[PDB]
Design a protein around this motif. Structure first.
Motif, PDB file in Angstrom:
ATOM      1  N   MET A   1       0.962  -1.067  -0.148  1.00  0.00           N
ATOM      2  CA  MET A   1       0.021  -0.039  -0.012  1.00  0.00           C
ATOM      3  C   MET A   1       0.960   1.165  -0.061  1.00  0.00           C
ATOM      4  SD  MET A   1      -3.439  -0.578   2.184  1.00  0.00           S
ATOM      5  CE  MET A   1      -2.985  -2.234   1.703  1.00  0.00           C
ATOM      6  N   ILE A   2       0.506   2.327  -0.821  1.00  0.00           N
ATOM      7  CA  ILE A   2       0.937   3.600  -0.718  1.00  0.00           C
ATOM      8  C   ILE A   2       1.212   3.987   0.709  1.00  0.00           C
ATOM      9  CG2 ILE A   2       1.141   6.018  -1.328  1.00  0.00           C
ATOM     10  CD1 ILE A   2       2.176   3.899  -3.601  1.00  0.00           C
TER      11      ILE A   2
ATOM     12  N   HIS B   1      -1.400   9.756   2.994  1.00  0.00           N
ATOM     13  CA  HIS B   1      -1.946   8.774   2.499  1.00  0.00           C
ATOM     14  C   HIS B   1      -1.600   7.423   3.564  1.00  0.00           C
ATOM     15  CE1 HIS B   1      -4.598   6.640  -0.475  1.00  0.00           C
ATOM     16  NE2 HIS B   1      -4.655   7.782  -0.933  1.00  0.00           N
TER      17      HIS B   1
ATOM     18  N   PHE C   1      -8.439  15.784  -1.850  1.00  0.00           N
ATOM     19  CA  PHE C   1      -7.000  15.322  -2.295  1.00  0.00           C
ATOM     20  C   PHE C   1      -6.534  16.089  -3.452  1.00  0.00           C
ATOM     21  CE2 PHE C   1     -10.273  12.299  -3.520  1.00  0.00           C
ATOM     22  CZ  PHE C   1      -9.903  12.238  -5.055  1.00  0.00           C
TER      23      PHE C   1
ATOM     24  N   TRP D   1      -3.132  12.102  -5.674  1.00  0.00           N
ATOM     25  CA  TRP D   1      -4.077  11.477  -4.780  1.00  0.00           C
ATOM     26  C   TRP D   1      -4.015  11.661  -3.362  1.00  0.00           C
ATOM     27  CZ3 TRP D   1      -8.103  10.100  -7.658  1.00  0.00           C
ATOM     28  CH2 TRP D   1      -7.841   9.676  -9.108  1.00  0.00           C
TER      29      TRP D   1
ATOM     30  N   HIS E   1      -9.009  -0.231   2.828  1.00  0.00           N
ATOM     31  CA  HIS E   1      -8.361   0.029   1.729  1.00  0.00           C
ATOM     32  C   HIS E   1      -9.336   1.463   1.182  1.00  0.00           C
ATOM     33  CE1 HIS E   1      -6.101  -3.777   0.880  1.00  0.00           C
ATOM     34  NE2 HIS E   1      -7.170  -4.123   1.821  1.00  0.00           N
ATOM     35  N   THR E   2      -8.671   1.905   0.045  1.00  0.00           N
ATOM     36  CA  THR E   2      -9.302   3.424  -0.241  1.00  0.00           C
ATOM     37  C   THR E   2      -9.434   3.258  -1.758  1.00  0.00           C
ATOM     38  OG1 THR E   2      -7.747   4.284   1.438  1.00  0.00           O
ATOM     39  CG2 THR E   2      -8.544   6.115  -0.207  1.00  0.00           C
ATOM     40  N   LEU E   3     -10.447   3.958  -2.027  1.00  0.00           N
ATOM     41  CA  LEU E   3     -10.911   3.961  -3.447  1.00  0.00           C
ATOM     42  C   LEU E   3     -11.250   5.574  -3.608  1.00  0.00           C
ATOM     43  CD1 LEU E   3     -11.734   3.129  -6.368  1.00  0.00           C
ATOM     44  CD2 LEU E   3     -14.039   2.757  -5.571  1.00  0.00           C
ATOM     45  N   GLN E   4     -10.446   6.109  -4.481  1.00  0.00           N
ATOM     46  CA  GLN E   4     -10.832   7.576  -4.794  1.00  0.00           C
ATOM     47  C   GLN E   4     -10.910   7.935  -6.312  1.00  0.00           C
ATOM     48  OE1 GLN E   4      -6.611   8.116  -3.149  1.00  0.00           O
ATOM     49  NE2 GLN E   4      -7.201  10.292  -2.730  1.00  0.00           N
TER      50      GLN E   4
ATOM     51  N   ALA F   1      -8.112   5.748  -8.452  1.00  0.00           N
ATOM     52  CA  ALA F   1      -7.063   5.419  -7.574  1.00  0.00           C
ATOM     53  C   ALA F   1      -7.383   4.484  -6.525  1.00  0.00           C
ATOM     54  CB  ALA F   1      -6.256   6.526  -6.881  1.00  0.00           C
TER      55      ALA F   1
ATOM     56  N   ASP G   1      -6.099   2.560  -3.207  1.00  0.00           N
ATOM     57  CA  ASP G   1      -4.604   2.602  -2.298  1.00  0.00           C
ATOM     58  C   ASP G   1      -3.630   3.460  -2.691  1.00  0.00           C
ATOM     59  OD1 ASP G   1      -6.171   1.019  -0.368  1.00  0.00           O
ATOM     60  OD2 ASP G   1      -4.995  -0.903  -1.357  1.00  0.00           O
ATOM     61  N   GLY G   2      -4.245   4.614  -3.035  1.00  0.00           N
ATOM     62  CA  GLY G   2      -3.325   5.631  -3.460  1.00  0.00           C
ATOM     63  C   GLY G   2      -2.547   5.580  -4.767  1.00  0.00           C
ATOM     64  N   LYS G   3      -2.878   4.520  -5.799  1.00  0.00           N
ATOM     65  CA  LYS G   3      -2.109   4.065  -6.944  1.00  0.00           C
ATOM     66  C   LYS G   3      -3.146   4.360  -7.898  1.00  0.00           C
ATOM     67  CE  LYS G   3       1.052   0.586  -8.581  1.00  0.00           C
ATOM     68  NZ  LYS G   3       2.502   1.181  -8.197  1.00  0.00           N
TER      69      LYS G   3
END
Ligand SMILES: OC[C@H]1O[C@@](CO)(O[C@H]2O[C@H](CO)[C@@H](O)[C@H](O)[C@H]2O)[C@@H](O)[C@@H]1O
Lengths: 100, 275, 9
Positions: A1-2, A32, A57, A61, B93-96, B117, B119-121
């Motif tokens: 994870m980032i 993040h 953000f 991101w 987990h994250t969804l943007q 994105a 998880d920040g990717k």
């Protein structure tokens, strides 16, 4: 994870003058994931009525938030911002300096 | 001038504690104008700028239903994504999501955006043609094939060329000077002795909108780029921004230094000095 | 105004 570590700035909305109503801001950005704890401190103690902006953000991101409270600066009173995040191995405390 | 509208969604799973938290915010340029939070008492779209308040009850009701449905969709996407990546069902987990339109002075669409994105990717993004997708990896190709079969890009294109542009035009008309006319910075230089031999000159820009600005120190008209401390531009909290730039100079040499300020709201670039 | 909901991913 980032994971990205938060950048922190602590400052007033207007140039501080003692005895004059103002806002104290703690801007946390570039982080993040989104889970983060931010306290504004007055003489080391947690300030109770603190609000924050809606989670948003940047193009990479990474998240940003503004935590803020109304305050009246004096000569004596010390203010700071305390931030906890997964990327920080202990809480980061940044002191308010009216010249920055 | 040229303007943009953007919506930013963030969904964060919390398995064992209920449905993901969904937060949305909307911006016109650098001005936030709406929010939605799924964890609010009675979740609804709420105004965050004065000029949006005039929209009628049908506006707020329609947008609220959209966000409630999107939160449920994001919840299903988060479930699908952890499956695609073979991840634990226990973790958060994250969804943007970010989408919107850039328009020129005539109000015509210059560019549309719709991207995601995980998880920040970067995960998947709608291409400039508004017709095709770019996927970051084989998980995202699953999503791409689903969205190709569902003709999702056409749904996005319709919004980005239609509603996005038309509503942005309307917000600008309603916003007026607050959105169309830049507010220049209030500026000043402060001086802080460090010792008998050195002092800090700090150049301040306060109360400006929009956020884009340049502050530079010069010594006899030569940029002091490698020796200037510059803070990131930061929100004042009243919809305007702040920045400063500082240089450390020899005591008695302050008169050699000038601060140069460029901002859209200024008639011409400013040159400041300690005075 | 926001875009109507996407299909899930
Ligand atoms: O943090 C303040 C809080 O701690 C208590 C103990 O629960 O007392 C400590 O701090 C006081 C204030 O500085 C001291 O006077 C005392 O010696 C110390 O034990 C509480 O009384 C107080 O509210």
């Amino acid at each position: 994870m980032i994971q990205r570590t938060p950048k922190i700035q602590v400052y007033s909305r207007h140039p501080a003058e003692n005895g004059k109503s103002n806002f104290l801001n703690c801007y946390v950005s570039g982080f993040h994931p989104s889970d983060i704890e931010v306290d504004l401190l007055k003489n080391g103690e947690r300030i109770e009525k603190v609000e924050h902006s809606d989670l948003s953000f940047s193009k990479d991101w990474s998240f940003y938030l503004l935590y803020y409270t109304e305050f009246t600066p004096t000569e004596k009173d010390e203010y700071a911002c305390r931030v906890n995040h997964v990327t920080l191995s202990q809480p980061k405390i940044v002191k308010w300096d009216r010249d920055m | 001038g040229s303007h943009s509208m953007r919506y930013f969604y963030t969904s964060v799973s919390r398995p064992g504690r209920g449905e993901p938290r969904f937060i949305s915010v909307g911006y016109v340029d650098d001005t936030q104008f709406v929010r939605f939070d799924s964890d609010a008492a009675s979740p609804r779209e709420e105004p965050r700028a004065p000029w949006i308040e005039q929209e009628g009850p049908e506006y707020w009701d329609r947008n609220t239903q959209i966000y409630k449905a999107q939160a449920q969709t994001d919840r299903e996407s988060l479930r699908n994504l952890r499956g695609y990546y073979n991840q634990s069902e226990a973790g958060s987990h994250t969804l943007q999501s970010m989408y919107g339109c850039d328009v020129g002075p005539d109000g015509r669409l210059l560019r549309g955006h719709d991207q995601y994105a995980y998880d920040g990717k970067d995960y998947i993004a709608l291409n400039e043609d508004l017709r095709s997708w770019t996927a970051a990896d084989t998980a995202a190709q699953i999503t791409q094939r689903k969205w190709e079969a569902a003709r999702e890009a056409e749904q996005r294109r319709a919004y980005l060329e239609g509603e996005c542009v038309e509503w942005l035009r309307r917000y600008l008309e309603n916003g007026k000077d607050k959105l169309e006319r830049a507010d220049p910075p209030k500026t000043h230089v402060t001086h802080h002795p460090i010792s008998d031999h050195e002092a800090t000159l700090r150049c301040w820009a306060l109360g400006f909108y929009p956020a884009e600005i340049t502050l530079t120190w010069q010594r006899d008209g030569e940029d002091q780029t490698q020796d200037t401390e510059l803070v990131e531009t930061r929100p004042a909290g009243d919809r305007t921004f702040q920045k400063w730039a500082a240089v450390v100079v020899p005591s008695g040499e302050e008169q050699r230094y000038t601060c140069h300020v460029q901002h859209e709201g200024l008639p011409k670039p400013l040159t400041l000095r300690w005075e | 105004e926001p875009r109507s909901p996407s299909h899930s991913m």
